[PDB]
Design a protein around this ligand. Sequence first.
Ligand SMILES: [Br-]
Ligand SMILES: [Br-]
Ligand code: NA
Lengths: 150, 156
Amino acid sequence: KFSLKSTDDLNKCIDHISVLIKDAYLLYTNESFATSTFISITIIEEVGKTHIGMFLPTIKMGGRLNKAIEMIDKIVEDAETGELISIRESSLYADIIDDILEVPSEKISKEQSRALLLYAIECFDDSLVGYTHHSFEVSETTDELFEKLA
Amino acid sequence: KFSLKSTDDLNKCIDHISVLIKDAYLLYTNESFATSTFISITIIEEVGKTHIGMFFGSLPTIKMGGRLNKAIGDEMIDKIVEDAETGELISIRESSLYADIIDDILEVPSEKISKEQSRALLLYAIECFDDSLVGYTHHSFEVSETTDELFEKLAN
Ligand SMILES: [Br-]
Ligand SMILES: [Br-]
Ligand code: NA
């Protein structure tokens, strides 16, 4: 379906994912933890679609993602499971779970939002930063926003 | 599938729709027109699910002097209405968040959704909420005061 033919195509997807990261960050800051989280899980599946379009990033362990959030194992497990899909659903859409009404603001925690954005940014960084001059420019904003969330 | 059995359920949904409106406005007001629009279209779909839930369906009834009529004009209302009837609003929603290869040229949200489109869809979504759900519960009127303000700001 989706295959990138050019270094310009990769820079377009880089740029777009920078927008989602700025929007996920903007939402987290304004305490919209559930909507932020929805955009955070989108980035991780969009980063994965881009990497595959050119033809998961193994935790550093001791690296800035550990020192900032342990909880990594959790997100990686939910990601492998297919559980991150249902967490994303529940982070934007209200739902009758069996016969109680469930709502985004009471399914996503401030720290869950913080962790998936920090994880999304690493997803993008480990996957795409390094393959163009442009990625390096972008990574310094990605870095500034990452550091600010710690 | 989705039904609501109490005014507590309705108000919780109403509150959630208030969150999405604030979020679409937050994004728009930054300059993330595309992500905004994804939320604005979601709001229109989740107002319908909710209205129907208590019984793109519930489109606002347009009146000649109406605040929306005033903020975006007759042409545009008609356009959004047609996009909702034919399901163009779903493709617009997909294109406002997800990169795509169409014909064989990479498409990105920033190049599909204009400021003008983003503004009109949030105003429109806000008027969906208001027409469909405000009046049902005493709490809805409280939330309408917030949504009314966001509406006033966006239309000037
Ligand atoms: Br470059
Ligand atoms: Br009352
Ligand atoms: Na009404």
